Every structure is written in C-alpha cells, then in structure tokens.
Design a protein around this nucleic acid. Sequence first.
DNA 1: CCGACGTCGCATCAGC
DNA 2: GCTGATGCGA
DNA 3: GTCGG
Length: 327
Amino acid sequence: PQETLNGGITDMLTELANFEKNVSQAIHKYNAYRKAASVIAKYPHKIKSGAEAKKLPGVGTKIAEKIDEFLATGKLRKLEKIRQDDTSSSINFLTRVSGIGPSAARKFVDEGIKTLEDLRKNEDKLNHHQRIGLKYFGDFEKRIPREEMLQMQDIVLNEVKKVDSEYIATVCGSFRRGAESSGDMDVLLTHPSFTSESQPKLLHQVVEQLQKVHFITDTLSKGETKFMGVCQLPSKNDEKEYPHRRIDIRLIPKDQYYCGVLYFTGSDIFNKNMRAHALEKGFTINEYTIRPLGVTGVAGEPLPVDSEKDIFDYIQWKYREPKDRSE
DNA sequence: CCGACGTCGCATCAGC
DNA sequence: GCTGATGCGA
DNA sequence: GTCGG
Ligand SMILES: Nc1nc2c(ncn2[C@H]2C[C@H](O)[C@@H](COP(=O)(O)NP(=O)(O)OP(=O)(O)O)O2)c(=O)[nH]1
Ligand SMILES: [Mg+2]
Ligand SMILES: [Mg+2]
Ligand code: NA
Ligand code: NA
C-alpha cells in the first residue's frame, strides 16, 4: 500500500521482532514477527481487527491478540514495559553496533557497559570488528546516494582492471537493482584462473590496491574468497569529508559467475521466493549452482549456466530485470 | 503434540 | 599446537 | 510465533 496504512502495527511487530532476536535470543520468534510485519505491510486495507489480520499467512492467534490491544489502546503493555527496562533496552541498542550481536550485547550490559560512551571507555573488551563498528557507528547508519555509488564503482572498476585487466568486477546488491540509494556496496570478483575445478592471491591483490589509493580504509574480515571492510570516496581540496561506507568484495569461481551475480543481486526477499518456486519445480538454487531435484528430493549435478535467464528458464519463470527484483 | 524455521565465509572461543 | 563449535553479518 | 506433518 503506502507504508503508513498499517504502519503502527508493522512498527509494533518490528520492535517485537528486535527484542526477540537481541534480548530473548529467540531467532525463530524474530522471523515470525518479521514475516507477519511483511505480509501486513503489503495488505491493501486498513486492518480493523486481529481476526481480520489473522486471515493472512504468518499471522496467528498471539499476534491477532496484540493487534486487538493496539487498536483498542494505541499501545502494547509488554512493549511499553520493556522499553523502560534499562537492561533490555540497553542490550537491544548495543546490537546496533556492527560486530556486537545478541550475545556480546548481553555480556557488555551484564558488566555495566550499556552505552556508546561505555564502549569508548572500554576498547580492551572489544574485538577488531566491534571497534570499527563503534568508530563508524553513525556513518554505517547513513545511506549512500546513487551518485556516490557510481563514483565508488568508478574507482573499483578502475583499480581492479589496473591490477589485472582480466578480472571482472560487478557491483551487485541494491545498486545493480538500480536503487536511488544503498546501505552499502557489494562487489563480485571473477578471474579466469579461479574456477570450481581450480594464481594464489587473487582477492588480496584487489584489496591491497584499493588500500593503496586510499579507497579502503579498514578491514573487518578478510579471507581468500570474502572481504568485508570500510571504504571512503576522496574529497576535494576544501570540501567536507565523505562518510565512511561498508563494502564487501567476493571472489567467485568464473564458471559460477551468474549464480553468484543472481544470488548477491537479490533482493534477499526476491531470492527467498525465487529459490522457493524452484523447490516446487524440482530444482534448487544456491549461490554456486542450480541443481535438479531427483524424485526423492535429492539434488543431482550442477547444470550449465551461461546467463542469468538460463536460471530463470529452468524454473518456469519469465526473466526479470534486476530493477524488478525488489521481491 | 511437536519439529521446522536457508545457507555461507570468517573471527573467535572451547576443549583436547 | 590442533579441531570442532559458536558468534556474527549477510 | 506460526505452520503443518
Ligand atoms: N544468504 C543471505 N543473503 C542475503 C541476506 N540478506 C541479503 N542477502 C544476499 C542478498 C542481498 O540483497 C544481498 C547483497 O547484500 P546486501 O548489501 O546486505 N543487501 P542489498 O544490497 O539488497 O541491500 P542494501 O542496499 O541495504 O545494501 O546478498 C540474507 O539474510 N541471507
Ligand atoms: Mg548492498
Ligand atoms: Mg552488503
Ligand atoms: Na493466519
Ligand atoms: Na550488531
């Protein structure tokens, strides 16, 4: 609809979801709430009763009751109570630091560490990832205008070709879907000498080069196929500095390029129903392959993939442009 | 009544 | 030292 | 928390 049609309900469900994940550490209740928030978020009428909402898939008795209470009062007593709870709301908040999950947040709060100030007082107790998440807390929650995304892409493609002209770098994620803004940058990397059957340092050449031209500023994690770090556009002689941005760089086998491009172009919710159709057509799709499903449900051998739409044709789907892969 | 609820790479911890 | 398990983000 | 075997 418009996100506001049942906004209060979906806001409430989302807040309930976060407390289940971060505080209660009940990941399945977390998803149950988000599943209900999502299906309500697309329901094109103003909900007037919990029973009305209960018609939708993912909405059960407990949520139906909560909707009734919300409609009657404009609030949930449980939600009002946990909001003012110092321990629970502190644990919930600290998980907004990249690197601090439900477990780390609990440990910090248990030993009296509850705010960003407390975190800054206590570098000793943070790991490498958490320090950077702390250092760029504000920046990581800013969004990236597409104009900056294009400027970031310019640098990536240029430096990647410079190291080795036979690389292929493809920016995926929300950018490739043509979104007006993005939360981060995801880059897919491929090279002729790295395929599933079979040069050592392919990912770390590229990382090193982007560090050399001062694009990449920090490293959260780095393996041989997956890089997670921080980047920043260069600013002009007098102009204000750009925010620091999250950037992932992944090295995928060349003969699995399109399955990776599809997978990491998303969106996550597009992917989850694309594999979902696939699981009902006798197919299965991961980030590497599309495999046929045998009579007893067992997956056979990887199929030939030479384009993104090959995957689409396999599974009864008209090809869809990245632009329409919002869900 | 009760088990399922995607999967993955990397960092770090538990334990031998 | 190591392997396996768990946390984390995605 | 919701769904379904
Ligand atoms: N396996 C898996 N993949 C996910 C998940 N979530 C997202 N992706 C897979 C598909 C995601 O689309 C994608 C690329 O990751 P992002 O940058 O995190 N998401 P995007 O670029 O769409 O949004 P944004 O503008 O906020 O950055 O990777 C997930 O929970 N699980
Ligand atoms: Mg992204
Ligand atoms: Mg990303
Ligand atoms: Na329902
Ligand atoms: Na976090």
